[PDB]
RNA sequence: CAAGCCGAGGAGAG
RNA sequence: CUCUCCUCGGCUUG
């Protein structure tokens, strides 16, 4: 391992106590300075006959294996014992015991918190911080309100204040936070920015920040920025299609008699549709809620039309209505006035919309703009042409990947492309799996795919190869994502583009984040040059305030929903105001999954075979007689006992009918009994 | 590989 | 404070 000139000075105070933060730019060898500090700490604690254990904390799963393979093990295999832990191994089970060996631990975080609270809640073995001598951290800037890793530090600070009251002493460990930039936390002034930086430093018990300032030229030579760049377009033709949908929506409303006080093709209208649906369901009146459920789909179609082709919206709708027709046929294998009206309104115009959509006379601007942007680079760079795209949604990524596969020009220039999204199981899309992600990364590194389409997955964590033409298509989150993307593009003649529309304030937000970036550095300078006594005074005040802001939050949120009422309810279907279950019939397995095993509920539903699995069904999707999907099948002890949700159902209390929607099971106060086979059997 | 439970952060709009 | 979008983590059934 090598010791750069400028990494030295930033690391230097850490080597003798002095818990600190380190903010360097991106690509400056952050992991490697971590490694060096580790080796020093351990060699030191050996030379003094003192036990030395370092633990690395990360936020993601892949960075653990990552750092185990590339940085820590290749250099410290020979002197010390290393390991890498996560939620995707089997070493989680005896975590108190791996500590008894393996002087270098890498870990996902909440492993640790689980073990601490197990030591402090049950009679398990567990662990405390006293069994360490260093905590290294990646991505400092997540240390904010009740995240994970701040429990850790609130406990560290609690014990530190115990030590300080003792002084007027357990040996507490050392802490070394590493980041790219701690970030201004949503503050409209330089002073509140300062306050936020100090809040971070208190939540890490720091002594300084240690930005590089002296050996700066070596950085500028070894490390460089891309060039910021904007590309803007404007559109007022909307020629056949938009109005062809606004007509439909207007017709539906004037069939429903609901006045939005708002516009078509935006986000407030959506919120109205939601609360109207929820109200109609709490009341029970149809003709309003199902229509709302469709209007939401139309609004989504218009929003994606603002960014994506008409054909993608037409397809989105085709999928929706095709599914609904299949549902009604599976049920009927009756035809209310509502659904009949809606279908008759849609399918008559289906062929028209298909004709209007395929019309290259007016496709879109931003797509053409990025066409020009992309072709410029891949004509310039010629087989060293890596590429990245950022967008907001997942469906957009599928659409863009499809298009770049379809249009000949992009394939001509060697533009081999793949999509990428996250593994969260929500949001009406089939997510990806970690394996597909890692494979795509290795394909990018290999060179199979020249450009990647991504959501906010790409701006942090996983280690993509250095790039050229990072762009930004309809996304401005905050300064952090801005800088982290801005730190991808090495490989000279790099850029950082932003592609937006005219009448949607985005360049606004881009500029705001630029000013925030320029502000946090001023605040860093304000605090590094702060006097030590005043700095100490302020961090002590903030640590006290943070620990007091925990206690209160603890006092008002012990349970907040505790009234356990076994069967005081009835669960109805939300589409059709129809009985489905009572609360007594329901039970729980492994105190997590809710389920019912009475034959009355058995006969009411229908199973529609899986499209997720076709990409032999194992987990059927339930539907009603009406058509509203309810749940999913489940296999407990071979019993195909069918699970369910509480997002599609409605509640009716027996007393006075404040019917409510909950969106998930924990929110409601009442408790349900555990399962046991004594019922239906014996 | 599929299903689901809980928690957390960020951003928009209101 | 609510809704939507996005990401992440831990945990269970198969
Ligand atoms: N001190 C060092 N000496 C030699 N090579 C280094 C050093 N630090 C980093 N490298 C090289 O830089 C690459 C890994 O470091 P780097 O690119 O900073 O990854 P990183 O830690 O993820 N940067 P970042 O994305 O900001 O966290 C490899 O090609 C290493 O060979
Ligand atoms: Zn129903």
XYZ file of C-alpha atoms (C1' of nucleotides) in Angstrom, chain B:
14
model
C -36.346 -16.860 -7.479
C -41.141 -15.470 -5.588
C -44.428 -13.399 -1.361
C -44.767 -10.384 2.559
C -43.445 -7.299 7.799
C -40.955 -3.247 9.884
C -37.778 0.912 10.040
C -34.812 4.991 7.683
C -33.266 8.891 4.328
C -33.866 12.209 0.040
C -36.918 15.001 -3.505
C -41.215 17.002 -5.426
C -46.573 19.041 -4.787
C -50.068 20.521 -1.547
